[PDB]
């Protein structure tokens, strides 16, 4: 089982087609509108940057 | 006698610690502990140090407001939108420029003639665009793009480097197409420096193709309709219409891609290619001077209609183009005798007037995506949190471990 | 009349439907011989009149496609590729009766 | 609203955040971190084996 | 100046639990509320009384 489980801790790809619950993947969504609005404002703060 | 195994296992390993916990304890704890601090704090450090010698590269640290890398937030923040959502339900709310016009005509030579003549391969026989190729230009000395965002360390002044890397863009451009058609949407992310370049992200869309050959997929024509949407649907998208110079603009796909699109130009401008195949054919001036005013194009594109044209072999540099650029339209009839002014039909007053365009539509459009995708959060987590109340924060890395642990017991 | 499949310059929306009608009046004959003439200055990709004869002569027995300004496959404005394989024929999507160069 | 877990559950999660980034946690920020790079060089130093 | 940078950032907090306290008393039994100060609802007492 540990190194099962060590092979699916690097098996990203089973990791993902494993864990598949819709919350996870809400999650996942919910991680990347976050990083997304951070760099929305960091682009947009770099606009800001004229006055 | 019950169970042996866990005494066992137990056992070597407080024998391990009593030989090596002068060691395992700095290791397996206190550096675990103070890595991720040091990561904030000191790794920072070593940043900062290398940031400095490339920001004198980009001169941002020299001049205010003045950075090459400054255009490179721009294509971060779309690079992370892209994985984070490709189809149309983000990306019709992204800015950037796209080239459109007839797969005929060369449309791509807008942009071949800044960056793209050295590294992408082109010439006439068969399709060349396979799927959208974003180019993000920037003003800096000459350096190897970015190919799939992948770090690349080549002359772009020699042919033996550029033949490598238009055989790298070539390869994206094929794999992105899979059975049943030519055309891809999946994109290729190109990221280059170099003298003439502008700050602006530019898009060469495959190339419309008004029916379907036998020697082409069946859905070619179709899918590069649906790839077409990323202008038709994107308010916030800059097209730039290429009509065949050769043919007249009656017989023209591009017309109908834009004129659904923004029927009054305020999303676009219209550029012509390969004008002097004008003169090569018996020329009419009296259809050029119904080009420039639109009359021939029912998009109505605003903006100073420019005209790319070139000795149309495939090996011409861009500094040839540029010159055979200038010397053609300051003298052919086409131009001179008709209300086109060189000096506007240039090409390079399309990438500084394309670039003029560039800002004003990002600036205005992309606070609206800050207040969009918040609301989005919201109600993301609203719905999210009152359907699964005990997760208020998951990843599927935490999701992974604690399954770990758990089969593990 | 050539068919032009959209309307600009002011003209009436009218014209490619007129035009089409006109065309058909002889492309649905079916003892008719059909020349189509395509522009040489663009690739084989963007051709206009292509999937009207393809409905109208599938089966290769009235259509010939004729390819003006053949000096710009000398020059390589157009794609000689293209160039011959609509000589060979492999890109009609369609039964042809001929080809012949302008 | 009235008489529902989820309502009490959010304000706990934004009152705990704004405890988060209150003054208790800012000043481990300016004491504490700025000499995780001294602790890294004494790791280092440790793992040395010429003290040893 | 010190003390300034260490420790003025953090008054945020206080100052945003104070504005949702506010606002939660509005919205449970204030949702037509506004920045009704000096000025509004004597406005809209006057016109009341004209009317
Ligand atoms: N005559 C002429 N030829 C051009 C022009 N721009 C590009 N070409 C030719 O078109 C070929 C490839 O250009 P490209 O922009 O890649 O067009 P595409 O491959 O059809 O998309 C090259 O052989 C160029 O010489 C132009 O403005 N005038
Ligand atoms: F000829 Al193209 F994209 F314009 F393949
Ligand atoms: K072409
Ligand atoms: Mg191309």
């Known amino acids: 089982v540990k190194e099962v489980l060590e092979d699916f801790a690097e098996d990203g790809e089973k990791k993902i087609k494993l864990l598949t619950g819709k919350r996870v993947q809400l999650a996942e969504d919910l991680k990347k509108v976050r990083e997304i609005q951070e760099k929305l404002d960091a682009f947009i703060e770099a606009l800001h940057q004229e006055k | 006698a019950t169970d042996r195994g866990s005494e066992s296992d137990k056992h070597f390993r407080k024998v391990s610690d009593k030989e090596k916990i002068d060691q395992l304890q700095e290791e397996l704890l206190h550096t675990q502990l103070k890595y991720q601090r040091i990561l904030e704090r000191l790794e920072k450090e070593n940043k900062e140090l290398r940031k400095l010698v490339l920001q004198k590269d980009d001169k941002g640290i020299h001049h205010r407001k003045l950075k090459k890398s400054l255009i490179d937030m721009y294509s971060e923040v779309l690079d992370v939108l892209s994985d984070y959502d490709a189809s149309y339900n983000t990306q019709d709310h992204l800015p950037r420029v796209v080239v459109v016009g007839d797969q005929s005509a060369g449309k791509t030579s807008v942009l071949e003639m800044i960056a793209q003549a050295r590294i992408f391969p082109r010439g006439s026989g068969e399709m060349m665009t396979?799927?959208?190729?974003?180019?993000?230009?920037?003003?800096?000395?000459?350096?190897?793009?970015?190919?799939?965002?992948?770090?690349?360390?080549?002359?772009?002044?020699?042919?033996?480097?550029?033949?490598?890397?238009?055989?790298?863009?070539?390869?994206?451009?094929?794999?992105?197409?899979?059975?049943?058609?030519?055309?891809?949407?999946?994109?290729?992310?190109?990221?280059?420096?170099?003298?003439?370049?502008?700050?602006?992200?530019?898009?060469?869309?495959?190339?419309?193709?008004?029916?379907?050959?036998?020697?082409?997929?069946?859905?070619?024509?179709?899918?590069?309709?649906?790839?077409?949407?990323?202008?038709?649907?994107?308010?916030?998208?800059?097209?730039?219409?290429?009509?065949?110079?050769?043919?007249?603009?009656?017989?023209?796909?591009?017309?109908?891609?834009?004129?659904?699109?923004?029927?009054?130009?305020?999303?676009?401008?219209?550029?012509?290619?390969?004008?002097?195949?004008?003169?090569?054919?018996?020329?009419?001036?009296?259809?050029?001077?119904?080009?420039?005013?639109?009359?021939?194009?029912?998009?109505?594109?605003?903006?100073?209609?420019?005209?790319?044209?070139?000795?149309?072999?495939?090996?011409?540099?861009?500094?040839?183009?540029?010159?055979?650029?200038?010397?053609?339209?300051?003298?052919?009839?086409?131009?001179?005798?008709?209300?086109?002014?060189?000096?506007?039909?240039?090409?390079?007053?399309?990438?500084?007037?394309?670039?003029?365009?560039?800002?004003?539509?990002?600036?205005?459009?992309?606070?609206?995506?800050?207040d969009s995708f918040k609301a989005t959060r919201f109600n993301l987590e609203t719905e999210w949190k009152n359907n699964y109340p005990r997760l208020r924060e998951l990843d599927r890395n935490e999701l992974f471990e604690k399954a770990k642990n758990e089969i593990l017991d």
Not at chain 2, 205 to 226: C, H, Q, R, W, Y
Not at chain 2, 318 to 326: G, K, L, N, T
Request: with cysteine.
């Open chain 2, 130 to 370: 396979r799927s959208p190729v974003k180019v993000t230009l920037s003003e800096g000395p000459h350096h190897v793009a970015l190919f799939k965002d992948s770090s690349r360390e080549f002359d772009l002044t020699k042919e033996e480097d550029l033949a490598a890397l238009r055989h790298e863009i070539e390869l994206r451009m094929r794999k992105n197409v899979k059975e049943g058609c030519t055309v891809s949407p999946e994109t290729i992310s190109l990221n280059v420096k170099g003298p003439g370049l502008q700050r602006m992200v530019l898009v060469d869309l495959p190339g419309v193709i008004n029916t379907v050959t036998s020697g082409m997929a069946p859905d070619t024509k179709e899918t590069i309709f649906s790839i077409s949407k990323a202008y038709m649907q994107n308010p916030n998208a800059i097209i730039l219409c290429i009509q065949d110079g050769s043919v007249d603009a009656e017989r023209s796909i591009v017309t109908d891609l834009v004129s659904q699109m923004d029927p009054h130009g305020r999303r676009t401008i219209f550029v012509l290619t390969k004008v002097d195949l004008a003169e090569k054919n018996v020329a009419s001036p009296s259809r050029i001077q119904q080009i420039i005013e639109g009359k021939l194009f029912p998009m109505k594109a605003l903006g100073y209609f420019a005209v790319v044209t070139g000795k149309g072999n495939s090996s011409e540099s861009i500094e040839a183009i540029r010159e055979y650029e200038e010397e053609f339209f300051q003298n052919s009839k086409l131009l001179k005798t008709s209300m086109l002014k060189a000096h506007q039909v240039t090409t390079r007053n399309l990438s500084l007037a394309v670039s003029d365009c560039f800002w004003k539509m990002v600036r205005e459009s992309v606070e609206q995506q800050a």
